[PDB]
Amino acid sequence: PDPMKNTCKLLVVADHRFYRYMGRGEESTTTNYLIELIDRVDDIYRNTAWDNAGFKGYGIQIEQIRILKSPQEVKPGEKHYNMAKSYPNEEKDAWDVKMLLEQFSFDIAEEASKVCLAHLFTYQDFDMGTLGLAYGGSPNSHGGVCPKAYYSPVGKKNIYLNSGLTSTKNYGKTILTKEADLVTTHELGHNFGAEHDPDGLAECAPNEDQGGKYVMYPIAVSGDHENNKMFSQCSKQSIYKTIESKAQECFQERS
Numbered sequence: 712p713d714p715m716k717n718t719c720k721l722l723v724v725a726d727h728r729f730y731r732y733m734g735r736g737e738e739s740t741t742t743n744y745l746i747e748l749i750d751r752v753d754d755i756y757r758n759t760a761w762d763n764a765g766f767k768g769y770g771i772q773i774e775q776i777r778i779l780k781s782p783q784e785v786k787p788g789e790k791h792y793n794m795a796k797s798y799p800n801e802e803k804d805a806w807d808v809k810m811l812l813e814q815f816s817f818d819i820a821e822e823a824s825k826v827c828l829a830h831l832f833t834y835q836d837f838d839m840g841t842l843g844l845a846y847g848g849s850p851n852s853h854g855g856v857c858p859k860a861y862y863s864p865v866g867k868k869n870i871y872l873n874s875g876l877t878s879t880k881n882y883g884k885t886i887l888t889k890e891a892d893l894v895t896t897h898e899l900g901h902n903f904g905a906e907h908d909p910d911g912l913a914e915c916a917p918n919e920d921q922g923g924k925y926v927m928y929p930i931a932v933s934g935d936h937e938n939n940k941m942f943s944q945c946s947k948q949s950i951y952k953t954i955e956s957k958a959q960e961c962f963q964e965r966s
């Protein structure tokens with residue numbers, strides 16, 4: 712482990728919805744929430760031994776927090792991840808999650824090329840209980856830690872796949888902080904290279920009396936069970952395949 716290259720620096724973006732609903736129209740409330748959330752997620756990462764031995768101390772730190780206090784004004788037909796209306800259905804509280812991540816990655820491309828990861832924090836009720844999305848760890852899909860260019864034929868420019876998003880709204884209410892911590896952990900988990908834990912591998916998907924599920928389980932975990940705030944051995948194997956190579960590529964020293 713390289714202590715000079717063990718931290719994935721993050722650009723954290725809070726959109727106007729997150730600012731209004733979670734930050735109560737205040738920057739200090741917005742930033743404190745995000746600073747504490749990343750630090751608790753960092754504790755999970757930093758304490759994980761990816762090889763089940765001494766390969767630990769790998770984590771995350773915020774480089775910058777961008778706070779979008781108001782919606783992004785758009786020209787008719789033009790779209791932006793921070794616009795007032797949801798896309799593609801303006802009548803719905805939320806965007807289609809996949810289109811929102813693509814849009815965020817498009818709009819943040821220049822900034823994203825200079826950071827290990829960009830993560831959007833929003834407050835919108837994604838259809839069917841979805842809480843987040845991220846590139847990487849998907850079973851021709853690519854992305855995750857360290858900017859990787861993708862030429863957008865629609866966008867007509869390179870976008871970077873080092874992105875993810877978390878919503879703190881679900882089924883018409885703010886999720887608990889213990890729940891939000893796990894969304895971000897899961898999404899950054901995909902960014903670090905983990906896929907979802909399968910039911911077919913009991914070691915990676917234990918029963919409730921055996922500590923419950925691990926953070927990469929596809930059905931959301933409310934941190935009440937022992938395993939909820941940990942990575943399965945499946946997640947560790949997947950992340951460990953590339954963690955060191957990615958660390959050499961874009962990770963920095965813990966500030």
Ligand SMILES: CC(C)C[C@H](CC(=O)NO)C(=O)N[C@H](C(=O)N[C@@H](C)C(=O)NCCN)C(C)(C)C
Nearest residue numbers: 839840841842843844893894897928929930931
């Ligand atoms: C933190 C969780 C693990 C993230 C995943 C989404 C995901 O895998 N993105 O990486 C999620 O939102 N899962 C939902 C989920 O488990 N939501 C819970 C909160 C829920 O709404 N359950 C309601 C039962 N119908 C799905 C899409 C499975 C409904």
Ligand SMILES: [Zn+2]
Nearest residue numbers: 897901907929
């Ligand atoms: Zn997932």
